């Protein structure tokens, strides 16, 4: 208990350091900036074909192909320009809650309640899509999966751990421990040297891929954390929680800058993503619609209300041209 | 409008759609059964009959394919993945009648679990089948061990019938939405082997109700 009191003593020191650095607020600096006008987005495409709830999606690096995972046991690679289905990959386990697209475009990944991440090879000598490797070693359900390159993947699981894999060997290169709850979301920094993880204990942590230790820890939320997204610069990230509240954290200041919460919203937040410039912050909610938040003044500037059930996945292209939202109504929609 | 390659791509997409529709039609025939039993509540006994995460059992009875999902291997929070199972035909629940004495008492924990899943947000219109297994030991244990040690508000004898009826009534009384949901209580008969028949009858009733709902007659 002596060490226990020391830990509380250090937490007092940590809080003092954070308060000493809070000379002002983000809301007091952007008081003279011009407000972003009413952002009206329309549905250009409606990608149909899924027969069950859509749980995740990811864009390719070419901003044209996207992969979607639904609980019917199917991965579909769509051509969003022409609404064509390039591929339809059948899964061995229909309980899939995550999907990923490799930066090169040769591999896609998926995972879920079966505690295995499956890597698929899209460009083979034959004409089918083959299962390359099945990464196992997690004792909990898989929440998110992101590619580092064609050989390394990072996986967040519900067993309070994140892991780094080497695909060619199938083993864990680095294992990340320190969360006290189920990890739900995971975002990679633009330099692929650091990544943030949000768990069920209302905490966000910054890890170091090459080293393997928790550089920083972030608190402030009151409930479960369901989404995380890196700022395009790489010195900030946004979180989404079940208490109808987004927040914008900072790495260099080690503090919370802004909170995006309204009074008429009481539902959870399922997906959080940014625009190309970082001025807009798209967020999906349980109330069947998505809102566009302005990241610098925390005032709502748009509502996307074309869906019939809970919006579960939301992504923005690499060039910022389109925002695609998928919901539990088995429809994807490309907004512009 | 379109080149030859674009037309062939459209044909490939249209064949993908046809195969997807065929797969969905085939999958709609199967019956989804969750088995969310309690700890040490005779789940091994209920999966013993069929005539590292989710464990799936596929058995057929009277030309109806049943897919049973044992999810008891998940040690994480139930709320985060409980919505993945909405749309199941039925939820098979197993409690141990011989765990009234063995203890936090197991029976009260089973009651809290049943109350948690019966009043859940996603399971308003999903029927729950309740199995009261391990009844052989209860017959001899009720004589030596009275039920009053666990249920002070009981005014019955020590016979097996009255105690079993009291347990069943208390388990069904935890239901709240008694308009679109039903509880099918049954005692596991090892020799008679009517468990599969009971599951078949419950699934048939659920299918009839769902068809009435879909036609517009409900």
């Amino acid at each position: 208990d002596q060490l226990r009191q020391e830990a509380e003593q250090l937490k007092n020191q940590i809080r003092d350091a954070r308060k000493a650095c809070a000379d002002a607020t983000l809301s007091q600096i952007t008081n003279n900036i011009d407000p972003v006008g009413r952002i009206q987005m329309r549905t250009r495409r409606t990608l149909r074909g899924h027969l069950a709830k859509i749980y995740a999606m990811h864009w390719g690096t070419d901003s044209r192909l996207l992969v979607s995972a639904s609980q019917d046991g199917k991965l579909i690679i769509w051509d969003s320009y022409t609404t064509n289905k390039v591929h339809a990959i059948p899964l061995r386990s229909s309980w899939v809650m995550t999907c990923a697209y490799a930066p090169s475009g040769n591999y896609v990944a998926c995972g879920g309640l079966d505690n295995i991440c499956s890597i698929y090879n899209l460009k083979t000598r034959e004409g089918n899509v083959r299962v390359s490797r099945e990464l196992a070693g997690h004792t909990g359900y898989l929440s998110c999966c992101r590619f580092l390159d064609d050989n390394q993947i990072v996986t967040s699981s519900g067993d309070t751990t994140c892991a780094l894999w080497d695909i060619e060997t199938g083993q864990q290169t680095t294992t990340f421990t320190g969360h006290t709850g189920d990890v739900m979301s995971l975002s990679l920094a633009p330099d692929t040297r650091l990544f943030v993880s949000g768990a069920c204990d209302a905490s966000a942590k910054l890890w170091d891929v090459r080293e393997g230790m928790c550089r920083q820890t972030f608190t402030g939320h009151e409930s479960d954390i369901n989404a995380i997204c890196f700022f395009p610069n790489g010195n900030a990230f946004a979180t989404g929680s079940d208490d109808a509240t987004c927040r914008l954290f900072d790495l260099r200041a080690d503090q919370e800058l802004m909170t995006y919460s309204h009074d008429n919203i009481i539902c959870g937040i399922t997906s959080v993503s940014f625009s190309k410039s970082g001025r807009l912050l798209l967020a999906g909610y349980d109330d069947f619609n998505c809102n566009v938040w302005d990241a610098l003044k925390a005032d709502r500037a748009g509502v996307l209300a074309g869906h019939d059930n809970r919006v579960s996945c939301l992504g923005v292209t690499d060039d910022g041209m389109a925002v695609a939202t998928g919901s539990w109504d088995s429809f994807l929609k490309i907004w512009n | 409008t379109l080149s030859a390659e674009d037309k062939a791509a459209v044909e490939r997409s249209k064949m993908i759609d046809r195969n997807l529709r065929e797969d969905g039609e085939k999958a709609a025939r199967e019956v989804k059964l969750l088995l969310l039993g309690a700890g040490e509540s005779g789940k091994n006994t209920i999966v013993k009959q069929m005539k590292t995460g989710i464990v799936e059992t596929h058995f057929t009875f009277k030309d109806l394919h049943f897919k049973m999902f044992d999810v008891g291997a998940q040690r994480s929070e139930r709320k985060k993945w409980i919505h993945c199972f909405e749309g199941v035909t039925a939820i098979i629940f197993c409690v141990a009648l011989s765990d009234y004495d063995l203890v936090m008492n197991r029976m009260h924990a089973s009651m809290k679990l049943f109350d948690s899943i019966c009043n859940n947000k996603w399971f308003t219109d999903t029927s729950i089948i309740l199995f009261l297994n391990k009844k052989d030991l209860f017959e001899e244990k009720i004589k030596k061990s009275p039920l009053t040690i666990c249920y002070p508000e009981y005014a019955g004898s020590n016979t097996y019938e009255e105690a079993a009826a009291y347990i069943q009534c208390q388990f069904e009384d935890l239901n709240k939405r008694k308009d679109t949901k039903e509880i099918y209580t049954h005692f596991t008969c090892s020799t008679d082997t009517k468990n599969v028949q009971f599951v078949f009858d419950a699934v048939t009733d659920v299918i009839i109700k769902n068809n009435l709902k879909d036609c517009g007659l409900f």
């Epitope: 390039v86 000598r125 089918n128 | 080149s3 030859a4 674009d6 062939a8 791509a9 044909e11 490939r12």
Partner: single-chain antibody, 232 residues
Framework: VQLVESGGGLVQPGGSRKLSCSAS????????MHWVRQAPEKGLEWVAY????????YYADTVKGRFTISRDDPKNTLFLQMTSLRSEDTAMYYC??????????????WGQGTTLTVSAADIVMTQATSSVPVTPGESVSISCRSS???????????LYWFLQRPGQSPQLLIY???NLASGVPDRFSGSGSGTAFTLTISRLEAEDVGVYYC?????????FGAGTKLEL
């Protein structure tokens, strides 16, 4: 991945014959199939095309009416039934597979061929230079011209390049004028715009000798070129 064709031989004029091709090593049911024939001491010529799903069949006007194409998915075989064979049907028929989705590589694998000897509005592609004296090490540029603009409104220029080594089958090099085929060395580069195209090789070796063909795929029928020999 290999395609072996069986059949052919000596057929009297006015007769009938069936050519068979056996495919092993790849998902046959997902690939479209073509028939391309080469007359003795002449260029390539298109014959027929059958798609995946057997929902679209096209023939060349030369052979339309008497030639029939078919596929048997469960047995992994391709068929071509010929009736009333003329003296212009003597050639060595090759079987070419092709798949069409976004980012595909059509005309990627060719068969070995069967020799068939008988007794006795289309887009035109111009490859004027029939031969080039070459030395190993220098850069070689090979051009091919077109009549209609191959640049579609999508942004793709449907031009294809092929290599035929002496005693071998044609092999894909460049598809859509800019993308390299798999297994092709990086010394091959394709460029051009509108109706004029060129192909450049940086460092020529002793394995690059052969005949170069240019093909269009904007609309059917698919017309080949005349060839450019690259003897040393």
């Amino acid at each position: 991945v290999q395609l072996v064709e069986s059949g052919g031989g000596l057929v009297q004029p006015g007769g009938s014959r069936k050519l068979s091709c056996s495919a092993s090593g790849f998902a046959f049911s997902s690939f479209g199939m073509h028939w391309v024939r080469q007359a003795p001491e002449k260029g390539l010529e298109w014959v027929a095309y059958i798609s995946s799903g057997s929902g679209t069949i096209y023939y060349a006007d030369t052979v339309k009416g008497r030639f029939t194409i078919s596929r048997d998915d469960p047995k992994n075989t391709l068929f071509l039934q010929m009736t009333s064979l003329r003296s212009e049907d003597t050639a060595m028929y090759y079987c070419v597979r092709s798949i069409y989705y976004y980012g595909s590589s059509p005309f990627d694998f060719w068969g070995q061929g069967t020799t068939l000897t008988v007794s006795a509005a289309d887009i035109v592609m111009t490859q004027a230079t029939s031969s080039v004296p070459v030395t190993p090490g220098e850069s070689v540029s090979i051009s091919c011209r077109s009549s209609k603009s191959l640049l579609h409104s999508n942004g793709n220029t449907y031009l294809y390049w092929f290599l035929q080594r002496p005693g071998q089958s044609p092999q894909l090099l460049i598809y859509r004028m800019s993308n390299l085929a798999s297994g092709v060395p990086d010394r091959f580069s394709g460029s051009g715009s509108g109706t004029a195209f060129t192909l450049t090789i940086s460092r020529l070796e002793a394995e690059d000798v052969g005949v170069y063909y240019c093909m269009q795929h904007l609309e059917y029928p698919l017309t080949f070129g005349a060839g450019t020999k690259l003897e040393l």
